[PDB]
Amino acid sequence: SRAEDYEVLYTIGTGSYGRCQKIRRKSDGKILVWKELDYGSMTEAEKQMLVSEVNLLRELKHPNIVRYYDRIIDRTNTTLYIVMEYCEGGDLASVITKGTKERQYLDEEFVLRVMTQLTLALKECHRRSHRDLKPANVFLDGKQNVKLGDFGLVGTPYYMSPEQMNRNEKSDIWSLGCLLYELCALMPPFTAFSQKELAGKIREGKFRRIPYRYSDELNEIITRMLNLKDYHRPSVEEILENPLILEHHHHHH
Numbered sequence: 489s490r491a492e493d494y495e496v497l498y499t500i501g502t503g504s505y506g507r508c509q510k511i512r513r514k515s516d517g518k519i520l521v522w523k524e525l526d527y528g529s530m531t532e533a534e535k536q537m538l539v540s541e542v543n544l545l546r547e548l549k550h551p552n553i554v555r556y557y558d559r560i561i562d563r564t565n566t567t568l569y570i571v572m573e574y575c576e577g578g579d580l581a582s583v584i585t586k587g588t589k590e591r592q593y594l595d596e597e598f599v600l601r602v603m604t605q606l607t608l609a610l611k612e613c614h615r616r617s618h619r620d621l622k623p624a625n626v627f628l629d630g631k632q633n634v635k636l637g638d639f640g641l642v643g644t645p646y647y648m649s650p651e652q653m654n655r656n657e658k659s660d661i662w663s664l665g666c667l668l669y670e671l672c673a674l675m676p677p678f679t680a681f682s683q684k685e686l687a688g689k690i691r692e693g694k695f696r697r698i699p700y701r702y703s704d705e706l707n708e709i710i711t712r713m714l715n716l717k718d719y720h721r722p723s724v725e726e727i728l729e730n731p732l733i734l735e736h737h738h739h740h741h
């Protein structure tokens with residue numbers, strides 16, 4: 489369990505946080521990634537907190553949660569490595585940006601994939617009771633699997649639920665709603681320049697139908713997730729009973 493067991497291929501992303509690099513396990517040549525963190529400038533508190541968060545990621549194993557592998561300490565450079573699975577398809581933010589740019593709507597089949605696997609990711613989290621549902625925290629592997637990252641475990645808070653906009657599992661359903669919405673329409677359901685304007689729109693509860701290449705059923709269920717009354721939003725179980733969701737929309741090994 490040392491850094492010498494792995495070889496850096498190259499950097500994927502840079503912090504902020506630190507650095508994110510694609511790596512190769514030397515023992516077998518498995519492709520992984522790790523997140524670089526430099527704790528050299530943290531108090532003992534922040535370091536204890538950090539060891540607390542790290543112990544959390546060692547707990548969750550689930551086919552739709554980004555899989556933790558290992559933690560590596562280098563007291564030499566005062567650098568912490570968190571090793572996880574490679575998600576070659578990158579994040580959803582990029583897919584959404586890419587579709588926005590090339591003006592190409594995603595396939596309903598792909599939407600159903602994200603809807604199905606994220607819902608399962610939720611049901612896992614609520615059980616162990618966390619992680620936030622936003623396009624940047626959703627990752628795609630090479631097998632059409634959708635995986636939830638660790639974020640949350642200046643910007644306009646597009647995915648704020650009406651309730652949390654004031655003073656609840658159904659709050660997550662809303663955010664999921666906003667996400668699939670953005671995935672269909674290539675833009676959030678509510679947009680504004682100030683947060684106050686945003687809150688004005690979220691409370692009115694009106695938005696556009698998602699594009700007509702997407703079926704009525706798909707739109708109905710997203711619409712129901714964006715209901716102002718949390719009790720009218722469907723449960724994880726209600727979402728899965730939907731005739732739209734089929735075996736092939738689930739995770740595969």
Ligand SMILES: C[C@H](/C=C\C(F)(F)F)Oc1cc(-c2cc(-c3cc(CN(C)C)cs3)cnc2N)ccc1C(N)=O
Pocket residue numbers: 500501502505507508521523554572573574575576577578579627637638639
């Ligand atoms: C810091 C990083 C979040 C974004 C960043 F990756 F851009 F930095 O943290 C996580 C990373 C991953 C993760 C991302 C990827 C990516 C692959 C590609 C394109 N390839 C073709 C080169 C762009 S990003 C691959 N595997 C990953 N495990 C997952 C979760 C997190 C997190 N913050 O929990």
